[PDB]
From a paper:
We used cryo-electron microscopy (cryo-EM) to determine the 2.1 Å resolution structure of this LH2 antenna, which is a cylindrical assembly of nine αβ heterodimer subunits, each of which binds three bacteriochlorophyll a (BChl) molecules and one carotenoid. Overlaps between the macrocycles of the B850 BChls ensure rapid transfer of excitation energy around this ring of pigments, which act as the donors of energy to neighboring LH2 and reaction center light-harvesting 1 (RC–LH1) complexes.
The LH2 complex is assembled as an inner ring comprising nine transmembrane α-apoproteins, which is 46 Å diameter in the transmembrane part of the complex and an outer, 76 Å diameter ring of nine β-polypeptides. The model in Figure 6D shows that this water molecule occupies a central role by bonding with the C132 ester oxygen of B800, while being held in place by hydrogen bonds with β-His22, and one of the α-COO-Met1 carboxyl oxygens. The C3-acetyl carbonyl of B800 forms hydrogen bonds with the β-Arg30 side chain, as shown by an earlier resonance Raman and mutagenesis study. The overall effect is a circular chain of carotenoid interactions interlinking each αβ heterodimer with its neighbor.
Residue numbers in the entry:
A (entry chain BF), D (entry chain BG), F (entry chain BE), H (entry chain BH), J (entry chain BD), M (entry chain BI), ...: 5 to 51
B (entry chain AF), C (entry chain AG), E (entry chain AE), G (entry chain AH), I (entry chain AD), K (entry chain AI), ...: 1 to 50
Write the structure that this text describes.
């Protein structure tokens, strides 16, 4: 567990970093999904 | 979700700026593509001037 | 507001210049897009010479 | 709390940095919001 | 599948960002090519404004 | 087998890295294959 | 005025050249935009030759 | 307060640097404001 | 086949990414050239919309 | 023969690296040769 | 004249080449702008030929 | 043949990638020039299509 | 006063560097001012 | 002639290549400008062909 | 011939690649200029085709 | 003759490197010469 | 005077470097002056 | 004379390097001079 890999992180630190990246991606995606529905409603795209 | 070990072999100070920069560039590319290929988006900027 | 741990794994001397530079570039891109696609912003610069 | 992460910061320092970034973003956003209302009022955009 | 020893002599913090960046760029290049060479993809963006 | 190569990895670590790259490629390829069938069905490409 | 702690985490030998370079580039961009979009600034350079 | 931060500066040094940046910005802005009044008076911009 | 000593004096972490990147770029250049100079490849993308 | 050259490799390691590069090139070339025959058959190139 | 402390926090190995390079680039930009936007400077190069 | 001492003062890990990269770029430039200036090479790509 | 700052200079060395930059700028500006008068006299600019 | 102390605070291995490179680039820029803005220089290359 | 002390203060691993690269680029620039401004050089590539 | 120069090579190593570069150049040139004869025969260049 | 400055040179070495730069500039300028007279004589520039 | 300068060379090594550069330049120039005579003879340049 305590092994420090060539990035300088441990396994647990690397998972902690990625979990925040996953969370941020979900926030971005949720906003983007709303923006696409707005774009579909308000622009000529999709009619 | 399963790829978290990427940060054992990629430095986050490299990969996280690259990841976010790529997202930002991608968004600009998409907006620029829509602007350059539709009439309706430049008409939106033009507003009541046309 | 919750992302403050980003500065544990990204160097601020990398990410803060990048963040502000990206904001500056984005603003220029938006202003340039409006200038190139509208008539009203070029007319503003042209002023009474038209 | 003492742990120095690979950026060279502690948790507390990293939060202190980000809080100033949050504050600066709010200032920029407040100014940008005012600029958009001025743009809507003075330019042909939105009529 | 057989090339796993590449990471004995290439640093993953170089090669993994490069690999993924190349994939991302390749995808953009293909999408941009279709957008610039077809009528049907810009017509899709143009939507009902045509 | 404990030899550390000039990348900083051992043989076993290098195979572990590449196996995740292989897995990720298969996921990307599966999604791309679906996207090509959708493109063929919904766009004028291939008729 | 309140942001002086930026120089605790950004190296001034990075950020100060970047800051001043960005200002210089911004000024050139603005002058270039006026030159390319107005007739009056080109006519100023052209002088009595018109 | 003698702490040397990752930039290599102390708090007091960092404030001393920024104060000179603030001063220089005010000089640039004062000159730019004069140049804008000259531009407004001498060019067709704003009439 | 006889040039394997190149990796005594070139770092593989430089030369292997460069070698593969050059191959990738070369392929893109060839595909782009065919796309830009033929009618038949853009017609293939255009499909039934022509 | 255990001499370490300026790349960080021994002679034996450098040959091991290059042999994999040779193998990969042969795979790429085999696929490219097939792709050229497909291109010749399916496209107007060469008639 | 009062800014001499800039060289306490910017390396002259960086800032002095940048400063002089920016001046050189700026001069080229101005000369190129005059060349491209006037007739009289191209005519000066053209001389007696037309 | 007589210049072999160049590798006493140039790093091969610099100069050998540069040398081969320059050769590769040069070849692309020559092929691109022929493609862009002849009719016969784009006709070769166009094949039976026109 | 003998403190060495993060550039590697002392205060006195930094002032000595900047004085030479100030001097050089004055020379450049003097030449540029002459060149502008020549440009005004010999070119159509300003008539 | 009086600026020789520049090499106390600029590394010559930076500044001397930059200085000579800038001179070389400047010369190319001037030659290219004359070539692109005169009839007489391209006519010199064209020779007896036209 | 008298400038050999340049290699006391410029690293040859910098300056020799730069020197040769500049020569190579210069040659390409000259050949490209002739190709783009004469008819006789593209006619030479075109050969019996036209 | 065992002196190590600033590249990290000895005289003998530097000659060994260059001799492989010379050999590779001759191979490339031989192939290029054949390609030029093919180009002259098969293309309109030189008639 | 034997002080080594941040470039790695002494005052005397820095002056020796610059003197060779001055000499080289004079040679370049002399050649350039001749080239301008040739250009004025042989080209339509200046008549 | 055995002093090692900031490039890592001695005076004698730096002269040895430059002499090979001078020789190479003369070879390039001799070839270029021949190529210019060929260009003058075979192309429309100079008639
Ligand atoms: C109208 C729709 C467009 C179009 C739109 C798009 C878009 C948009 C995209 C693609 C993408 C791809 N397209 Mg498509 N595409 C079109 C038509 C084609 C045609 C064709 C002849 O008509 C081909 C060959 C392809 C092929 C491809 C793939 C190369 C690529 C996805 C690869 C992947 O997932 O690998 C995954 C791989 C695997 C799962 C397994 C691989 C196993 C084998 C054995 C490996 C062999 C390796 C080889 C020997 C060596 C490789 C060397 C390296 C290149 C260095 N498309 C049409 C014209 N296509 C995507 C892409 O490139 O993404 C980056 C993409 O984004
Ligand atoms: C229709 C076909 C095209 C065409 C298509 C192509 C294509 C496509 C390519 C070439 C390539 C080459 N072409 Mg051809 N080529 C055409 C017509 C020409 C003409 C001409 C006047 O008509 C010339 C001079 C050339 C010449 C050349 C070579 C310079 C080059 C291969 C060099 C090599 O293998 O060296 C090997 C060298 C040796 C074996 C020995 C050298 C020994 C000598 C003594 C060394 C002297 C060195 C000198 C003094 C100093 C050099 C300094 C360095 C440049 C820094 N071609 C026609 C118009 N040609 C290839 C290329 O550039 O690849 C990178 C290439 O890919
Ligand atoms: C038809 C022919 C073309 C033309 C073709 C070319 C070509 C081609 C070239 C030049 C080159 C040059 N041309 Mg001419 N040139 C033309 C007409 C002009 C006109 C003009 C108003 O008509 C001017 C001012 C110039 C001037 C110049 C020089 C700036 C330059 C050579 C400088 C040199 O050797 O310095 C040597 C300097 C000295 C010996 C002494 C200097 C001493 C002084 C006191 C130093 C003062 C420094 C100052 C205060 C600060 C400088 C700051 C730095 C810029 C950072 N040409 C015509 C239109 N010219 C060459 C060039 O730029 O090469 C790089 C070049 O290759
Ligand atoms: C027609 O073709 C055109 C022209 C349109 C071109 C084609 C373009 C295409 C194909 C575009 C495709 C775009 C795509 C695929 C976009 C994808 C976007 C995604 C997935 C965005 C994700 C965003 C995620 C974000 C913003 C995440 C932020 C995370 C943050 C801020 C957390 C930061 C902190 C850490 C990573 C670690 C903290 C440390 C700890 C110890 C916890
Ligand atoms: C049609 O398409 C077009 C052409 C328009 C292209 C599309 C463009 C698009 C899509 C543009 C989108 C733009 C966006 C998303 C812009 C976002 C802007 C934001 C969020 C700006 C934020 C700015 C924040 C600032 C300026 C913050 C400054 C902070 C400062 C100065 C504090 C500095 C100090 C520290 C960080 C730490 C100090 C240290 C301590 C220890 C306290
Ligand atoms: C007509 O010409 C045009 C214009 C179209 C130009 C031509 C374009 C062409 C020819 C394009 C060709 C494109 C190709 C060949 C695309 C290939 C795409 C592929 C193969 C994509 C693969 C993607 C793979 C991914 C996304 C893998 C992700 C893996 C992840 C996230 C795992 C990360 C973790 C690790 C590597 C190690 C973790 C550590 C451990 C210790 C386990
Ligand atoms: C229509 O769209 C177009 C095309 C026009 C594009 C749009 C362009 C836009 C949107 C442009 C916007 C431009 C802006 C926002 C420009 C802002 C300019 C500013 C704020 C300039 C500030 C300049 C400040 C200067 C020059 C400060 C100099 C400071 C100096 C010299 C002091 C140096 C010393 C130190 C920092 C520390 C010394 C050390 C000590 C220990 C004391
Ligand atoms: C008309 O002109 C146009 C416009 C067309 C421009 C002209 C373009 C031209 C002239 C293009 C020419 C293209 C050429 C010459 C392409 C050549 C392609 C080749 C030779 C490709 C080779 C590919 C090889 C690959 C993909 C090899 C992969 C190897 C791998 C993955 C193994 C990796 C592992 C290691 C190297 C070492 C592992 C470590 C160990 C200890 C065993
Ligand atoms: C219409 O828009 C267009 C297209 C025209 C674009 C717009 C362009 C614009 C807006 C251009 C603006 C240009 C400006 C603002 C130019 C400014 C030029 C300046 C201020 C030039 C200054 C030059 C100074 C020089 C050459 C100084 C040289 C100093 C030397 C050689 C001394 C070197 C030594 C040291 C620094 C230290 C020595 C060490 C010691 C220990 C003493
Ligand atoms: C009209 O103008 C246009 C547009 C055409 C532009 C003009 C273009 C022009 C002027 C192009 C000119 C092109 C030229 C001059 C091309 C020259 C090509 C040459 C000389 C190519 C040489 C290639 C050599 C190769 C591929 C050598 C490979 C060597 C290898 C693989 C060996 C690698 C190993 C080592 C170096 C050392 C191993 C270590 C040991 C200890 C033994
Ligand atoms: C219309 O606008 C256009 C388009 C034309 C653009 C405008 C362009 C403009 C404005 C161009 C202006 C060009 C200028 C200002 C050019 C200036 C040229 C100069 C000053 C050239 C100087 C050349 C000097 C040389 C070649 C010196 C070489 C020195 C050497 C080789 C000595 C090397 C050794 C050492 C430095 C140190 C040795 C070590 C020792 C210990 C002794
Ligand atoms: C109309 O305007 C256009 C468009 C044409 C643009 C204008 C272009 C212009 C103005 C172009 C001007 C071009 C010029 C000035 C070209 C100059 C070319 C020269 C001088 C070339 C010299 C070449 C020299 C070579 C190839 C030397 C090679 C030396 C070698 C291989 C030896 C390598 C070894 C060592 C340096 C050291 C070995 C170590 C030891 C210990 C002995
Ligand atoms: C990477 C960005 C790619 C943008 C590609 C689109 C550029 C404009 C294409 C031509 C204009 C299409 N049109 C006429 C419908 O506007
Ligand atoms: C755009 C002009 C750029 C000029 C070069 C700027 C400095 C490059 C980096 C070398 C100097 C810094 N350092 C620390 C290595 O001495
Ligand atoms: C535009 C030509 C560029 C030539 C390549 C750049 C010069 C070589 C730089 C070498 C840097 C690595 N180094 C100093 C350890 O050798
Ligand atoms: Ca809609
Ligand atoms: Ca409005
Ligand atoms: Ca279809
Ligand atoms: Ca006005
Ligand atoms: Ca066929
Ligand atoms: Ca005048
Ligand atoms: Ca023929
Ligand atoms: Ca004349
Ligand atoms: Ca002739």
């Amino acid at each position: 567990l305590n092994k420090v890999w060539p990035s300088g992180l441990t396994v647990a630190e690397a998972e902690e970093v990625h979990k925040q990246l996953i969370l941020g991606t979900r926030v971005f995606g949720g906003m983007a999904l709303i923006a696409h529905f707005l774009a579909a409603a308000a622009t000529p795209w999709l009619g | 979700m399963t790829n978290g070990k990427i940060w054992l072999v990629v430095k986050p100070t490299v990969g996280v700026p690259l990841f976010l920069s790529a997202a930002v560039i991608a968004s600009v590319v998409i907006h620029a593509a829509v602007l350059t290929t539709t009439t309706w988006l430049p008409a939106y900027y033009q507003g009541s001037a046309a």
